[PDB]
Design a protein around this ligand. Structure first.
Ligand SMILES: [Mg+2]
Ligand SMILES: [Zn+2]
Ligand SMILES: [Zn+2]
Ligand SMILES: [Zn+2]
Lengths: 97, 112, 554, 177, 171, 87, 270, 107
DNA sequence: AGTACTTTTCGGTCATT
RNA sequence: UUCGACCAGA
DNA sequence: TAAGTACT
């Protein structure tokens, strides 16, 4: 079935935080990607076996994170990139506030 | 005084029908419309232009148009918006998520 | 989610840094040269040429290989590729600025058109808001069309101070299709119309100052004006433009995979002109073609008509189109999704449930499942459900062990067998009193979605209590309703502790309760009241028995 | 992995990874000015062999102790004495530590926490940088040349005579065997 | 050369172990994933000091599984050779391409052609060696090398050193 | 970061546990309990985690700490023990 | 629209209403920090009523045979008559109830005295009543000091905001004022003894409850009030099924759009 | 304060901000016939010392931007004549709690 | 300154690519 | 799969 | 349907 926009706004109202996620992630999309702790991208060439990780270019192998985001969102990003736009995914805020 | 009117008028629209809404609601809205400076409209023209992140406004009326000028002016998004997280698959800072929980190792001993 | 452990630490996204790809970066990232426009058939031989899709990029045919990255299909997200263009092209969406920028700076030297020297400018240089400086700056120098070399400082208008030089008059500019053209006024008379070559624009930008960027809504690290022009083109990997196979010996390519195919073609053709019979300007008749495709690929709903129809007259899904509001990604994939653990049917009233319940049909209860974790507290009960099977009602239909592997209870040669292990999970059937989220769209209320108690019942309908009718705003003239099932011990909590119907009784939207008594029960509660109305023993006894909490005191 | 008390704001262009040479230019992770947990500043911590042998032993020991509060609820002679301290408070599969103790205990230059102390009190009047004030401690040096040449970061930081005196008091403190 | 750097690490504890002596388990695991590790930005982690005052701080419960994550702050003894660093160690392996010295937890290798000339290589020796006019280098023989360059890798670090300068060789 | 940590004194938030807090503490705790975590109350025969939680939460024997963040980023720390539970 | 425009608004732990920027939109949710759900239409008795009748009800004069509490009500009835130190509190009280009157009449000019307010006091007493089987016959046992000095001690505990300073604690007083008017309205000496014969027990109870009750009606930092407020308005907007003004739905549309050329423009000049 | 009748010449007004610190203001007669602050709706405003303001901020942990704003040309902003940066405290009546304290910074 | 244009506005069937 | 039409509904 | 901006 469909947990559309309104069905969200509702849980938001309810304050039913986690449930909202559970609907959005675990019971739907939910995907695990790897990022470069330098250039917030999906670049990372994760061989999840020989634990190699790399990311030539920003050239890494050390600073690499892993995250969970809706596949659709991955796509959103990749799509945006295909449009030459860069959406950086950083795992730590540096702008304070 | 404008707020005072903008409210009064909105209140009336809901009274004419013989319905009732607790001040606070109409207030809040009438307020969001005002604070900023004058009469900010509830439309892609107004509010969806504020300093709010990109990803957030991104989800209403202008999407791509908005995203494009986001990376072109290298914006930075806080990810404090309900939307922001929903798009990332993270727990939004909302009710249940307006705080964190921890295992106090100390108190975890007095208990036994 | 995703499966297969990764020694990589896991965090949550905290910031989203928006930028623009620098040709140099695009190259570094890519793992594919992408020279050929073809798809595969190494001469019909099935596979994939080191040309387009997978010249090292992602895959298909259910085959590990993703640059050894293996893992295969599910897990290996895409790996961007690139495609070195022939000559710089605009960015269909940026044209607006690229233009509005030139109008802010003069060519040849490439520098601002209003220094701290002009006071009106000062004011426009204190405003801290990329979107606003650049909106005021522009309004200020869009008018002046003479790269002043000497201006009257903060003193006498008599004395003239110097700065940058080259008064080369500034041409006003207008937009014709995907190209920028401007006229240079000559005094003595008559204009001078010439097309602004990208090659040219791009350059004037490359030379704009470091502090000049910034002054104008930009960012030295993430978005230099010079990047609004495409030199290198990132190539989205299959997963963005997947195929569709009808087994084998057929096709199935995606819209995008074609516009690249075109862009590619239109690019090569160009190249083979500047290294061959180059009738100088019989080329810019084929360089506009690249600017076109590389434009339409991203946006295809422009002003200059030509829809770039694909043989058969079908429009062509531009990337932009995929994100555009409603029905698309952002709004229809992210802000709202289709989900699992959900059911819907026809609702009908039942004067025999408590308010906070909801009758679920056995049919569904046996379909919907809740993952429970084998615990000493339950081991017993759980093992019984498992045994019971996925056909009997109180039962379960999936046992999952630590070894991240699913035991399909309805087939597994061991269904009857199996002893659970503390720590295993046993997806079981929904059971009497499993908190669930019930709802009737359109949902425009906290209450349009409330937590009910699951009461497994016969017959095919969600049977809801009457009094909880007005909140959802539902009738039974064939009205349907949606049920969602929680999944984590904590998720339920969130429903039961905040969304449970008993809780919604009084609403803040009008500081008064939001459910009451209707139809029969109401109409009858009046009659049953009247002075005139009396009741005799035999019955007053049955009526008493009915209020479940009767203290048994006639 | 194991982060290190200093969030260096990496803004995209990670390119300047200088060289590592006895130009007292050690990775950013080893500037003379590093940060302590308390949040305070503190000089780098350079350990010359045998001084390290003591810090390790000292912790490996006081571990075996607090590893029993909870339990309830001569050269060749030290090799055996240490092997045990490991097969008691070590991971045993820390083949490195084993090998670091042999080495660390074989090429060491001091046995008394009193002798290593004076060595320090001594070199710590030089104003030299931690890395030098280490090598000097763990490397035999008879001439100002054997020194000012195996530790080229010194060269102009100390008069040969002066550095020669220091070298004297070292062989004079150098515990026997 | 050996250092005492201040580090930190994040451990994800399963609710299982939310016992009475959790602290105990944490530390325990701290050590499982550090003492013996290796990096290019820290090099050889050898020993966690001050086992007792290890800071755990309040760990926060993740939010899908009760696993909690504490930022175990600690301090330990590290060691990462450098280029131009002079160290002496015991030789270990020795072939026709050079011998390999073992400076602590690391192995520094010296090339046949990175030594002097009057020092040739004797094959028919038992055990294998390198002879000189007055010097002889083989297994147990102690050498003092100058690490020309470093190469990090996996969970170890190797490097090539020379004995062609002065005050370099046997002892 | 500690300048962003407010002292147990000077504390200013609500002395009582917010409905979302308890909502989450119970869930969170329930979850952990269901994970075979240790239970700090004698189960009077109970066997449902959220039920055990509700119990732990009433004898205020729950080792959790609610960290309340403020708009500017600084937070306050309260303990299920402290927090009053009206509702 | 309404929604998307107020998603990000919620009450933060400081009891301020903000959005994702931290932009205060309301300093106290709804100008009072009370959760809509805990509210009922009460009547501020102190408002209406002839200046004459106002006295006959709230006025107490211990120095007058005809304006004192007849000892048939209070236990220490006869031993009070005349006392001058009490008539000071007793007068302080009245000067206040009166200050109140004028205040309300400055806020609710319509004279309308029924308003939504946390803590239903009427009922809270109604219970106090039949909970202690209070007899409208025998005399109370309250000190006039008992009453007046505890009602004052109550207001001190109806805390909405907490802050340890002036700017904050000054807001506190603000976001409570109206409620208290209603409070003193119903806990005035004369009333407390003649209208609802409370005993010390009753009164000390009625107090304790009002406090707790109040403290529950506050708003929980966490509430996503924005989406709430949005819906609360937008919901009854759908139900709108349809003197010559612009009307409902089209008008609301006209308002949210902030349109320069509104169909009906009008303007009422008194 | 200069009170013009029907208008001032665009040649003159561009002479006000040319002599700081001092400041000048231009008011039309027809606009001052009635005092707007006397209107039923308009609640009373109040200037705040750069002392009282640096406070409001500290007490709410606000940054200048997160504060509600009033227009540099807002009728009442002129009546009192604020300056980009000055804060006005708006105190009004309320059907939820007698009085409500609000703050408006300026742009 | 007027006219045209764009956006925004919870199931199965048929036909063609 | 996609577009489009219809529908059908509440 | 109907309004509002941006655009011709
Ligand atoms: Mg219906
Ligand atoms: Zn990278
Ligand atoms: Zn791959
Ligand atoms: Zn120029």
């Amino acid at each position: 079935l469909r947990f559309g926009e309104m069905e969200r706004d509702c849980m938001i109202a309810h304050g039913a935080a986690s449930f909202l996620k559970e609907r959005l992630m675990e019971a739907s999309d939910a995907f695990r990607v790897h990022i470069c702790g330098i250039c917030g991208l999906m670049t990372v060439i994760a061989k999840l076996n020989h634990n190699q990780f790399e990311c030539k270019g920003c050239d890494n192998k050390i600073d690499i994170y892993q995250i969970h985001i809706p596949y659709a969102a991955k796509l959103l990003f990749q799509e945006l990139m295909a449009m030459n736009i860069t959406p950086r995914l950083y795992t730590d805020r540096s702008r304070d506030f | 005084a404008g707020r005072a009117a903008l409210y009064k008028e909105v209140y009336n629209v809901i009274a004419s029908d013989g319905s009732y809404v607790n001040y606070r609601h109409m207030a809040l809205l009438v307020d969001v419309m005002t604070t900023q400076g004058g009469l900010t409209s509830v439309t892609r023209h107004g509010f969806n232009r504020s300093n709010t992140g990109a990803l957030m406004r991104c989800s209403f009326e202008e999407t791509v148009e908005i995203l494009f000028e986001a990376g072109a002016s290298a914006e930075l998004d806080d990810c404090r918006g309900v939307s922001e997280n929903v798009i990332l698959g993270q727990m939004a800072p909302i009710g249940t998520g307006a705080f964190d929980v921890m295992i106090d190792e100390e108190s975890l001993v007095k208990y036994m | 989610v995703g499966q297969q452990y990764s020694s990589a630490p896991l965090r949550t996204v905290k910031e989203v840094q928006f930028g623009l790809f620098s040709p140099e970066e695009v190259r570094a990232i890519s793992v594919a040269k992408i020279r050929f426009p073809e798809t595969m058939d190494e001469t019909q031989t099935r596979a994939k040429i080191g040309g387009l899709n997978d010249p090292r990029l992602g895959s298909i045919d259910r085959n590990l290989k993703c640059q050894t990255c293996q893992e295969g299909m599910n897990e290996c997200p895409g790996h961007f590729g690139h495609i070195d263009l022939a000559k710089p092209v605009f960015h269909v969406g940026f044209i607006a600025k690229i233009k509005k920028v030139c109008e802010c700076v003069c060519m040849h030297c490439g520098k601002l058109l209003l220094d701290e020297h002009n006071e009106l400018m000062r004011q426009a240089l204190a405003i801290k808001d990329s979107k606003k400086r650049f909106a005021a700056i522009w309004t200020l120098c869009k008018t002046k069309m003479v790269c002043e070399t000497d201006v009257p400082s903060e003193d006498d208008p008599t004395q003239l101070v110097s700065r940058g030089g080259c008064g080369n008059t500034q041409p006003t500019i207008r937009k014709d299709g995907l190209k920028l053209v401007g006229s240079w006024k000559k005094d003595r008379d008559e204009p001078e119309l010439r097309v602004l070559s990208t090659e040219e624009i791009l350059n004037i930008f490359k030379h704009i100052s470091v502090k000049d960027f910034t002054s104008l809504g930009f960012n030295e690290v993430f978005s230099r004006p010079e990047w609004m022009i495409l030199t290198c083109l990132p190539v989205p990997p299959p997963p963005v433009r997947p195929s569709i196979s009808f087994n084998e010996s057929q096709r199935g390519e995606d819209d995008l995979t074609f516009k690249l195919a075109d862009i590619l073609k239109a690019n090569i053709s160009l190249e083979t002109l500047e290294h061959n019979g180059a009738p100088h300007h019989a080329i810019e008749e084929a360089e506009s073609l690249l600017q076109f495709h590389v434009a339409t690929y991203m946006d295809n709903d422009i002003a200059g008509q030509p829809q770039a129809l694909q043989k058969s007259g079908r429009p062509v899904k531009s990337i932009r189109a995929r994100l555009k509001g409603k029905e698309g990604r952002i709004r229809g994939n992210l802000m709202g999704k289709r989900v699992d653990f959900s059911a819907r049917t026809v609702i009908s009233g039942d004067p025999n449930l408590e308010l906070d319940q909801v009758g679920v049909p056995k049919s569904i209860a046996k379909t919907l499942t809740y993952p429970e974790v084998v615990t000493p507290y339950n081991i017993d009960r759980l093992t019984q459900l498992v045994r019971n099977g996925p056909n009997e009602h109180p039962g379960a239909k999936y046992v999952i062990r630590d070894s991240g592997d699913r035991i399909d209870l309805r087939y597994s040669k061991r269904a009857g067998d199996i002893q659970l292990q503390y720590g295993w999970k046993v997806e079981r059937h929904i059971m009497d009193n499993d908190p669930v989220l019930f709802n009737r769209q359109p949902s425009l209320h906290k209450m349009s979605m409330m937590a009910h108690r699951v009461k497994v019942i016969p017959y095919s309908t969600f049977r809801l209590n009457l009094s909880v009718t007005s909140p959802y705003n539902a009738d039974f003239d064939g009205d349907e309703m949606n049920l969602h099932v929680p999944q984590s011990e904590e998720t339920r909590a969130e429903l039961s502790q905040l969304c449970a119907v008993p809780l919604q009784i009084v609403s803040p939207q009008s500081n008064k309760p939001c459910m009451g008594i209707v139809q029969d029960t109401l109409c009858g509660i009046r009659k049953l009241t009247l002075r005139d109305t009396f009741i005799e023993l035999d019955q007053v006894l049955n009526m008493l028995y009915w209020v479940p909490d009767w203290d048994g005191v006639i | 992995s194991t982060s290190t008390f200093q969030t260096r704001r990496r803004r995209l262009k990670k390119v300047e990874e200088e060289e590592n040479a006895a130009t007292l230019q050690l990775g950013q992770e080893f500037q003379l000015k590093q940060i302590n947990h308390q949040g305070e500043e503190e000089e780098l911590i350079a350990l010359n062999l045998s001084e390290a042998r003591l810090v390790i032993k000292e912790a490996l020991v006081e571990r075996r102790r607090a590893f029993k509060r909870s339990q309830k609820k001569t050269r060749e002679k030290e090799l055996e004495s240490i092997d045990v301290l490991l097969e008691q408070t070590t991971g045993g599969n820390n083949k490195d530590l084993k090998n670091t103790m042999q080495y660390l205990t074989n090429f060491s230059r001091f046995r008394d926490q009193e002798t290593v102390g004076a060595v320090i009190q001594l070199l710590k009047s030089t104003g030299l940088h931690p890395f030098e004030v280490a090598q000097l401690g763990s490397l035999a040096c008879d001439t100002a040349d054997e020194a000012k040449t195996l530790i080229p970061s010194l060269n102009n930081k100390i008069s040969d005579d002066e550095l020669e005196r220091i070298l004297k008091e070292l062989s004079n403190l150098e515990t026997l065997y | 050369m050996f250092f005492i750097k201040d580090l930190s690490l994040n451990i994800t504890l399963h609710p299982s172990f939310f016992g009475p002596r959790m602290k105990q388990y944490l530390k325990t695991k701290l050590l499982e994933e550090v003492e013996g590790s290796c990096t290019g930005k820290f090099g050889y982690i050898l020993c966690v000091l001050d086992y007792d005052n290890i800071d755990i701080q309040r760990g926060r419960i993740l939010p899908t599984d009760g696993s909690a994550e504490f930022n175990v702050k600690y301090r330990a003894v590290v060691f990462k050779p450098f280029k131009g660093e002079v160290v002496d160690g015991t030789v270990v392996s020795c072939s026709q391409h050079g011998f390999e010295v073992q400076v602590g937890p690391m192995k520094v290798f010296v090339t046949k052609h990175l030594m002097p000339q009057d020092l040739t290589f004797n094959a028919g020796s038992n055990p294998p060696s390198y002879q000189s006019s007055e010097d002889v280098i083989t297994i147990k023989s102690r050498i003092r090398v100058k690490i020309e360059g470093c190469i990090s890798q996996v969970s170890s670090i190797h490097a090539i050193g020379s004995i062609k300068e002065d005050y370099l060789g046997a002892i | 970061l500690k300048e962003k940590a407010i002292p147990k004194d000077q504390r200013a938030t609500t002395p009582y546990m917010t409905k979302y807090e308890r909502a989450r503490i119970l869930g969170t705790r329930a979850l952990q309990i269901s994970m075979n975590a240790p239970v700090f109350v004698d189960l009077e025969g109970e066997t449902d985690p959220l039920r055990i939680a509700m119990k732990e939460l009433a004898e205020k024997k729950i080792p959790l700490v609610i960290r309340r963040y403020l708009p500017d980023g600084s937070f306050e720390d309260w303990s299920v023990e402290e927090l009053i539970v009206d509702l | 629209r309404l929604v998307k425009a107020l998603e990000d608004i919620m009450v933060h732990y400081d009891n301020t209403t903000r959005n994702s920027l931290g932009n205060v939109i309301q300093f106290i949710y709804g100008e009072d920090g009370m959760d809509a759900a805990h509210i009922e239409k009460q009547s501020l008795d102190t408002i209406g009523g002839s200046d004459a009748a106002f006295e006959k009800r709230y006025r107490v004069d211990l120095l007058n045979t005809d304006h004192t509490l007849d000892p048939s009500l209070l236990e220490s009835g006869s031993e009070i008559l005349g006392d001058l130190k009490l008539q000071v509190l007793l007068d302080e009280e009245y000067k206040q109830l009166v200050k109140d009157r004028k205040f309300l009449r400055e806020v609710f000019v319509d004279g309308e005295a029924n308003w939504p307010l946390p803590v239903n006091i009427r009922r809270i007493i109604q219970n106090a009543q039949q909970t202690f089987h209070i007899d409208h016959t025998k005399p109370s046992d309250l000190t006039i000091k008992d009453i007046v000095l505890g009602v004052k001690d109550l207001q001190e505990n109806l805390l909405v905001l907490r802050g340890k300073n002036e700017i904050i604690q000054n807001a506190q007083r603000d976001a409570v004022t109206l409620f208290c008017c209603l409070l003193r309205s119903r806990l005035a000496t004369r009333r407390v003894l003649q209208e609802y014969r409370l005993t010390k027990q009753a009164f000390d109870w009625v107090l304790s409850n009002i406090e707790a009750q109040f403290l529950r009606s506050v708003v929980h930092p966490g509430e996503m009030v924005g989406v709430l407020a949005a819906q609360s308005i937008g919901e009854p907007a759908t139900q709108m099924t349809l003197k010559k003004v612009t009307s409902g739905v089209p008008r609301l549309k006209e308002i949210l759009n902030v349109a320069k050329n509104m169909k009906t423009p009008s303007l009422t000049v008194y | 304060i200069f009170v013009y009748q029907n208008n001032i010449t665009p040649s003159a007004m561009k002479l006000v901000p040319s002599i700081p610190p001092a400041t000048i203001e231009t008011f039309n007669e027809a606009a001052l016939v009635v005092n707007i602050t006397h209107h039923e709706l308009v609640p009373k405003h109040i200037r705040l010392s750069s002392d009282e303001k640096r406070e409001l901020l500290k007490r709410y942990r606000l940054k200048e931007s997160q504060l509600p704003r009033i227009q540099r040309a807002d009728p009442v902003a002129l009546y009192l004549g604020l300056k980009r940066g000055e804060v006005v405290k708006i105190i009004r009546k309320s059907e939820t709690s007698g009085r409500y304290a609000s703050y408006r910074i300026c742009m």
